[PDB]
């Protein structure tokens, strides 16, 4: 891949993971 | 012809039943986080699905519909396994509720993916720290970090969901957020370092690896904490006696279902076999009778678990 796409991906993963329930 | 796929479906089902039968050998730990009443509903639902599969298994072997026979077999195997897990879980819950019993616990199993991601991320971060790394090297390290941290977060999500212990369930997800947050921050410093390779941007990109490596180490350490390791319960003699109805019925259903599938495997090849049709109906009768006896016993112990 390219650096721009890798940045988009980990930023989108961060948005999804930060909503995960811990319970 | 197309019998080969049906034969293999029967082999897979038989192997799978042999695997879930060990759950009944000596229940000394919970299988999952289901309540006694969830177990009740699960046994109910899975038996409905099994009853329709037994008719599909029988009709399609008689009528030579080999794809529909295979799919009935696959459906029955999944329902038998679901059934057995809920019965083994219920049995455990019955046995440890005796006041002379002592609780056990499921150990958390460590994903083998953890070790792979861990080593990969460390080498990628060590690369990003070399005082002379290039733009191509920085791109490859970012690619490796992104791929293995994404996989790490998903392993945490799945490990959280199958952990009954609430402290471990929470830590897996907190670790996932630590990994995701520090990865996002690291790739942002890589984005700046890219095309501006000063000692100052190298130092910052280097500094950004430390939180990600800490998250990864913290996660792999917690996975080894002794307080989450498997411990077998001490079921009292009165605990064992109380789980006997559930355990015996589950075993009998498994034994008979195994004999049913083994017989249907041959009838799918040559269905002109009256002796085996009568064996198969005998096994199917016992499958049904055992499910009735297990459900009946579970429904009757039920007030004690409210």
Tab-separated table of C-alpha atoms in Angstrom:
chain	number	residue	atom	x	y	z
A	1	UNK	CA	0.000	0.000	0.000
A	2	UNK	CA	0.778	3.740	0.123
A	3	UNK	CA	1.425	5.882	3.191
A	4	UNK	CA	-1.736	7.981	2.767
A	5	UNK	CA	-3.957	4.876	2.673
A	6	UNK	CA	-2.239	3.335	5.729
A	7	UNK	CA	-2.916	6.544	7.664
A	8	UNK	CA	-6.608	6.552	6.704
A	9	UNK	CA	-6.885	2.888	7.753
A	10	UNK	CA	-5.387	3.164	11.226
A	11	UNK	CA	-7.363	6.365	11.871
A	12	UNK	CA	-10.610	4.589	10.902
A	13	UNK	CA	-9.661	1.589	13.020
A	14	UNK	CA	-9.058	3.952	15.978
A	15	UNK	CA	-12.529	5.452	15.598
A	16	UNK	CA	-14.108	1.984	15.565
A	17	UNK	CA	-12.031	0.476	18.386
A	18	UNK	CA	-12.588	3.424	20.724
A	19	UNK	CA	-16.334	2.685	20.770
A	20	UNK	CA	-15.962	-0.969	21.785
A	21	UNK	CA	-17.746	-1.994	24.936
A	22	UNK	CA	-15.547	-3.209	27.776
A	23	UNK	CA	-18.481	-4.993	29.444
B	1	UNK	CA	-19.577	-39.357	-7.915
B	2	UNK	CA	-20.974	-36.573	-5.738
B	3	UNK	CA	-21.017	-39.073	-2.858
B	4	UNK	CA	-17.450	-38.103	-1.902
B	5	UNK	CA	-18.524	-34.769	-0.418
B	6	UNK	CA	-21.276	-36.481	1.571
B	7	UNK	CA	-18.838	-39.093	2.893
B	8	UNK	CA	-16.451	-36.349	4.029
B	9	UNK	CA	-19.262	-34.391	5.705
B	10	UNK	CA	-20.009	-37.519	7.731
B	11	UNK	CA	-16.327	-37.906	8.659
B	12	UNK	CA	-16.157	-34.261	9.820
B	13	UNK	CA	-19.337	-34.574	11.882
B	14	UNK	CA	-18.091	-37.773	13.569
B	15	UNK	CA	-14.742	-36.159	14.421
B	16	UNK	CA	-16.529	-33.092	15.786
B	17	UNK	CA	-18.824	-35.209	17.997
B	18	UNK	CA	-15.792	-37.025	19.386
B	19	UNK	CA	-14.308	-33.619	20.288
B	20	UNK	CA	-17.396	-32.236	22.076
B	21	UNK	CA	-17.782	-35.516	24.010
B	22	UNK	CA	-14.680	-34.725	26.060
B	23	UNK	CA	-16.697	-31.844	27.528
B	24	UNK	CA	-18.826	-34.510	29.272
B	25	UNK	CA	-15.936	-36.613	30.564
B	26	UNK	CA	-15.611	-34.812	33.888
B	27	UNK	CA	-17.029	-31.271	33.858
B	28	UNK	CA	-14.849	-29.250	36.258
B	29	UNK	CA	-14.985	-25.796	34.649
B	30	UNK	CA	-17.512	-23.538	32.885
B	31	UNK	CA	-17.576	-23.737	29.079
B	32	UNK	CA	-18.812	-20.182	28.567
B	33	UNK	CA	-20.701	-17.366	30.283
B	34	UNK	CA	-24.249	-18.646	29.697
B	35	UNK	CA	-26.681	-18.664	32.616
B	36	UNK	CA	-28.548	-21.815	33.619
B	37	UNK	CA	-31.589	-20.409	31.797
B	38	UNK	CA	-29.585	-19.524	28.704
B	39	UNK	CA	-28.420	-23.143	28.655
B	40	UNK	CA	-32.078	-24.204	28.858
B	41	UNK	CA	-33.016	-22.084	25.832
B	42	UNK	CA	-29.947	-23.250	23.903
B	43	UNK	CA	-30.764	-26.924	24.422
B	44	UNK	CA	-34.319	-26.141	23.264
B	45	UNK	CA	-33.327	-24.263	20.098
B	46	UNK	CA	-30.600	-26.709	19.096
B	47	UNK	CA	-32.929	-29.696	19.544
B	48	UNK	CA	-35.473	-28.120	17.200
B	49	UNK	CA	-32.719	-27.690	14.584
B	50	UNK	CA	-31.491	-31.236	15.211
B	51	UNK	CA	-34.947	-32.750	14.775
B	52	UNK	CA	-35.312	-31.227	11.316
B	53	UNK	CA	-31.795	-32.335	10.381
B	54	UNK	CA	-32.521	-35.955	11.328
B	55	UNK	CA	-35.468	-35.917	8.934
B	56	UNK	CA	-33.336	-34.266	6.247
B	57	UNK	CA	-30.524	-36.767	6.818
B	58	UNK	CA	-32.938	-39.681	6.449
B	59	UNK	CA	-35.035	-38.459	3.513
B	60	UNK	CA	-32.151	-37.332	1.331
B	61	UNK	CA	-30.155	-40.543	1.794
B	62	UNK	CA	-33.252	-42.533	0.813
B	63	UNK	CA	-33.975	-40.309	-2.222
B	64	UNK	CA	-30.344	-39.927	-3.348
B	65	UNK	CA	-30.100	-36.125	-3.014
B	66	UNK	CA	-26.432	-36.031	-2.086
B	67	UNK	CA	-26.005	-32.240	-1.650
B	68	UNK	CA	-29.101	-32.016	0.544
B	69	UNK	CA	-27.908	-35.029	2.561
B	70	UNK	CA	-24.496	-33.440	3.141
B	71	UNK	CA	-26.085	-30.190	4.309
B	72	UNK	CA	-28.401	-32.012	6.710
B	73	UNK	CA	-25.348	-33.761	8.192
B	74	UNK	CA	-23.491	-30.444	8.581
B	75	UNK	CA	-26.567	-28.930	10.220
B	76	UNK	CA	-26.968	-31.831	12.655
B	77	UNK	CA	-23.300	-31.670	13.676
B	78	UNK	CA	-23.521	-27.959	14.476
B	79	UNK	CA	-26.719	-28.494	16.505
B	80	UNK	CA	-25.289	-31.479	18.399
B	81	UNK	CA	-22.173	-29.500	19.323
B	82	UNK	CA	-24.206	-26.454	20.378
B	83	UNK	CA	-26.410	-28.749	22.446
B	84	UNK	CA	-23.467	-30.465	24.187
B	85	UNK	CA	-21.790	-27.189	25.175
B	86	UNK	CA	-24.990	-25.922	26.808
B	87	UNK	CA	-25.446	-29.263	28.596
B	88	UNK	CA	-21.831	-29.334	29.836
B	89	UNK	CA	-22.197	-25.713	30.962
B	90	UNK	CA	-25.440	-26.485	32.794
B	91	UNK	CA	-23.889	-29.586	34.375
B	92	UNK	CA	-21.022	-27.494	35.718
B	93	UNK	CA	-23.427	-24.928	37.146
B	94	UNK	CA	-25.409	-27.694	38.894
B	95	UNK	CA	-22.318	-29.344	40.384
B	96	UNK	CA	-20.625	-26.249	41.799
B	97	UNK	CA	-23.764	-24.909	43.411
B	98	UNK	CA	-23.514	-27.633	46.055
B	99	UNK	CA	-22.164	-25.930	49.224
B	100	UNK	CA	-19.454	-28.586	49.559
B	101	UNK	CA	-18.122	-27.870	46.028
B	102	UNK	CA	-15.444	-25.282	45.181
B	103	UNK	CA	-15.510	-23.097	42.066
B	104	UNK	CA	-13.241	-23.557	39.081
B	105	UNK	CA	-12.443	-21.268	36.205
B	106	UNK	CA	-11.712	-21.313	32.511
B	107	UNK	CA	-8.221	-20.209	31.715
B	108	UNK	CA	-8.004	-17.583	29.039
B	109	UNK	CA	-6.332	-19.022	25.987
B	110	UNK	CA	-3.646	-16.831	24.441
B	111	UNK	CA	-4.074	-16.287	20.664
B	112	UNK	CA	-1.065	-17.550	18.727
B	113	UNK	CA	-1.640	-14.413	16.662
B	114	UNK	CA	-0.491	-12.395	19.706
B	115	UNK	CA	3.019	-13.734	19.496
B	116	UNK	CA	3.256	-13.137	15.752
B	117	UNK	CA	2.002	-9.540	15.896
B	118	UNK	CA	4.215	-8.868	18.923
B	119	UNK	CA	7.439	-9.939	17.236
B	120	UNK	CA	6.469	-8.201	13.985
B	121	UNK	CA	5.651	-4.887	15.656
B	122	UNK	CA	8.883	-4.919	17.693
B	123	UNK	CA	11.088	-5.496	14.638
B	124	UNK	CA	9.187	-2.860	12.658
B	125	UNK	CA	9.572	-0.361	15.517
B	126	UNK	CA	13.238	-1.204	15.949
B	127	UNK	CA	13.630	-0.494	12.231
B	128	UNK	CA	11.849	2.877	12.527
B	129	UNK	CA	14.393	3.759	15.250
B	130	UNK	CA	17.554	3.212	13.150
B	131	UNK	CA	19.227	6.644	12.804
B	132	UNK	CA	19.662	6.129	9.045
B	133	UNK	CA	16.350	4.614	7.883
B	134	UNK	CA	15.022	5.667	4.447
B	135	UNK	CA	11.583	6.596	3.063
B	136	UNK	CA	11.158	3.078	1.626
B	137	UNK	CA	12.112	1.509	4.973
B	138	UNK	CA	9.725	3.832	6.787
B	139	UNK	CA	6.897	2.806	4.424
B	140	UNK	CA	7.515	-0.915	4.961
B	141	UNK	CA	7.610	-0.544	8.753
B	142	UNK	CA	4.334	1.416	8.651
B	143	UNK	CA	2.752	-1.316	6.490
B	144	UNK	CA	3.812	-4.041	8.936
B	145	UNK	CA	2.709	-2.082	12.031
B	146	UNK	CA	-0.702	-1.338	10.535
B	147	UNK	CA	-1.333	-4.907	9.451
B	148	UNK	CA	-0.369	-6.522	12.768
B	149	UNK	CA	-2.003	-3.933	15.056
B	150	UNK	CA	-5.267	-4.289	13.113
B	151	UNK	CA	-5.050	-8.058	13.606
B	152	UNK	CA	-4.130	-7.616	17.281
B	153	UNK	CA	-7.219	-5.451	17.921
B	154	UNK	CA	-9.493	-8.023	16.295
B	155	UNK	CA	-7.901	-10.847	18.350
B	156	UNK	CA	-8.593	-8.794	21.471
B	157	UNK	CA	-12.211	-8.269	20.422
B	158	UNK	CA	-12.735	-12.004	19.926
B	159	UNK	CA	-10.820	-12.946	23.062
B	160	UNK	CA	-12.902	-10.465	25.077
B	161	UNK	CA	-16.156	-11.967	23.789
B	162	UNK	CA	-15.201	-15.530	24.745
B	163	UNK	CA	-13.849	-14.633	28.202
B	164	UNK	CA	-16.347	-14.995	31.039
B	165	UNK	CA	-14.136	-13.212	33.583
B	166	UNK	CA	-15.185	-9.523	33.549
B	167	UNK	CA	-11.775	-8.152	34.514
B	168	UNK	CA	-10.127	-10.041	31.655
B	169	UNK	CA	-12.957	-9.123	29.274
B	170	UNK	CA	-12.345	-5.433	30.073
B	171	UNK	CA	-8.547	-5.600	29.814
B	172	UNK	CA	-8.592	-7.164	26.326
B	173	UNK	CA	-10.643	-4.226	25.040
B	174	UNK	CA	-8.610	-1.595	26.929
B	175	UNK	CA	-5.454	-3.106	25.447
B	176	UNK	CA	-7.086	-2.922	21.987
B	177	UNK	CA	-7.750	0.816	22.463
B	178	UNK	CA	-4.162	1.360	23.714
B	179	UNK	CA	-2.804	-0.379	20.607
B	180	UNK	CA	-5.149	1.502	18.241
B	181	UNK	CA	-4.503	4.906	19.803
B	182	UNK	CA	-0.722	4.552	19.899
B	183	UNK	CA	-0.659	3.138	16.349
B	184	UNK	CA	-2.655	6.090	15.035
B	185	UNK	CA	-0.230	8.466	16.762
B	186	UNK	CA	2.811	6.603	15.452
B	187	UNK	CA	1.671	6.659	11.826
B	188	UNK	CA	1.068	10.425	12.163
B	189	UNK	CA	4.716	10.931	13.109
B	190	UNK	CA	5.719	8.677	10.192
B	191	UNK	CA	3.626	10.903	7.936
B	192	UNK	CA	5.620	13.940	9.119
B	193	UNK	CA	9.011	12.192	9.021
B	194	UNK	CA	8.209	11.195	5.424
B	195	UNK	CA	10.089	13.698	3.265
B	196	UNK	CA	11.524	15.681	6.206
B	197	UNK	CA	14.087	13.259	7.673
B	198	UNK	CA	15.675	15.574	10.230
B	199	UNK	CA	17.157	14.266	13.451
B	200	UNK	CA	14.192	16.019	15.101
B	201	UNK	CA	11.557	14.112	13.128
B	202	UNK	CA	13.511	10.868	13.601
B	203	UNK	CA	13.531	11.467	17.362
B	204	UNK	CA	9.769	12.125	17.400
B	205	UNK	CA	8.946	9.118	15.247
B	206	UNK	CA	11.285	7.152	17.520
B	207	UNK	CA	9.521	8.498	20.635
B	208	UNK	CA	6.099	7.512	19.205
B	209	UNK	CA	7.083	3.806	19.092
B	210	UNK	CA	7.461	3.647	22.897
B	211	UNK	CA	3.701	3.865	23.711
B	212	UNK	CA	2.899	1.184	21.114
B	213	UNK	CA	5.567	-1.178	22.431
B	214	UNK	CA	4.335	-0.604	25.988
B	215	UNK	CA	0.738	-1.439	24.932
B	216	UNK	CA	1.885	-4.630	23.225
B	217	UNK	CA	4.042	-5.707	26.181
B	218	UNK	CA	1.296	-4.919	28.695
B	219	UNK	CA	-1.159	-7.030	26.685
B	220	UNK	CA	1.152	-10.041	26.375
B	221	UNK	CA	1.954	-9.855	30.102
B	222	UNK	CA	-1.702	-9.728	31.225
B	223	UNK	CA	-2.438	-12.758	29.024
B	224	UNK	CA	-0.038	-14.700	31.298
B	225	UNK	CA	-1.324	-13.440	34.676
B	226	UNK	CA	-1.774	-16.440	36.998
B	227	UNK	CA	-5.135	-15.230	38.321
B	228	UNK	CA	-6.665	-15.977	34.894
B	229	UNK	CA	-5.299	-19.510	34.497
B	230	UNK	CA	-7.547	-22.562	34.331
B	231	UNK	CA	-8.349	-24.131	37.704
B	232	UNK	CA	-10.490	-27.294	37.970
B	233	UNK	CA	-13.451	-27.063	40.317
B	234	UNK	CA	-13.724	-29.423	43.303
B	235	UNK	CA	-17.165	-30.958	42.772
B	236	UNK	CA	-18.539	-32.618	45.882
B	237	UNK	CA	-19.952	-36.165	45.714
B	238	UNK	CA	-23.403	-34.585	46.122
B	239	UNK	CA	-22.527	-32.185	43.332
B	240	UNK	CA	-21.626	-35.091	41.027
B	241	UNK	CA	-24.813	-37.005	41.858
B	242	UNK	CA	-26.864	-33.902	40.999
B	243	UNK	CA	-25.269	-33.469	37.547
B	244	UNK	CA	-25.757	-37.161	36.605
B	245	UNK	CA	-29.170	-36.744	34.851
B	246	UNK	CA	-27.835	-34.020	32.561
B	247	UNK	CA	-24.486	-35.725	31.885
B	248	UNK	CA	-25.964	-39.205	31.212
B	249	UNK	CA	-28.619	-37.845	28.854
B	250	UNK	CA	-26.077	-35.707	26.966
B	251	UNK	CA	-23.737	-38.707	26.585
B	252	UNK	CA	-26.539	-40.977	25.415
B	253	UNK	CA	-27.670	-38.405	22.829
B	254	UNK	CA	-24.048	-38.149	21.604
B	255	UNK	CA	-23.571	-41.929	21.445
B	256	UNK	CA	-26.806	-42.419	19.492
B	257	UNK	CA	-26.228	-39.468	17.159
B	258	UNK	CA	-22.781	-40.880	16.361
B	259	UNK	CA	-24.333	-44.233	15.528
B	260	UNK	CA	-27.018	-42.505	13.481
B	261	UNK	CA	-24.495	-40.558	11.370
B	262	UNK	CA	-22.234	-43.609	10.938
B	263	UNK	CA	-25.230	-45.552	9.561
B	264	UNK	CA	-26.484	-42.742	7.337
B	265	UNK	CA	-23.010	-42.493	5.812
B	266	UNK	CA	-23.426	-45.995	4.388
B	267	UNK	CA	-27.060	-45.482	3.406
B	268	UNK	CA	-26.039	-42.445	1.339
B	269	UNK	CA	-23.849	-44.806	-0.729
B	270	UNK	CA	-26.249	-47.764	-0.982
B	271	UNK	CA	-29.733	-47.039	0.419
B	272	UNK	CA	-31.093	-50.504	-0.397
B	273	UNK	CA	-30.304	-51.782	3.096
B	274	UNK	CA	-33.325	-52.574	5.317
B	275	UNK	CA	-31.191	-53.709	8.315
B	276	UNK	CA	-29.409	-50.326	8.385
B	277	UNK	CA	-32.655	-48.347	7.994
B	278	UNK	CA	-33.945	-50.065	11.122
B	279	UNK	CA	-30.683	-49.421	12.991
B	280	UNK	CA	-30.863	-45.763	11.982
B	281	UNK	CA	-34.442	-45.405	13.243
B	282	UNK	CA	-33.395	-47.039	16.514
B	283	UNK	CA	-30.599	-44.527	17.001
B	284	UNK	CA	-32.884	-41.632	16.049
B	285	UNK	CA	-35.469	-42.802	18.586
B	286	UNK	CA	-32.794	-42.743	21.324
B	287	UNK	CA	-31.557	-39.313	20.221
B	288	UNK	CA	-35.086	-37.925	20.719
B	289	UNK	CA	-35.755	-39.760	23.983
B	290	UNK	CA	-32.458	-38.536	25.483
B	291	UNK	CA	-33.162	-34.913	24.537
B	292	UNK	CA	-36.590	-35.210	26.138
B	293	UNK	CA	-35.027	-36.583	29.338
B	294	UNK	CA	-32.329	-33.873	29.474
B	295	UNK	CA	-34.772	-31.013	28.906
B	296	UNK	CA	-37.224	-32.439	31.464
B	297	UNK	CA	-34.552	-32.640	34.158
B	298	UNK	CA	-33.281	-29.126	33.388
B	299	UNK	CA	-36.773	-27.622	33.552
B	300	UNK	CA	-37.319	-29.205	36.987
B	301	UNK	CA	-34.073	-28.100	38.686
B	302	UNK	CA	-34.872	-24.621	37.367
B	303	UNK	CA	-36.410	-22.994	40.522
B	304	UNK	CA	-33.178	-23.650	42.442
B	305	UNK	CA	-31.239	-21.504	39.949
B	306	UNK	CA	-33.578	-18.459	39.947
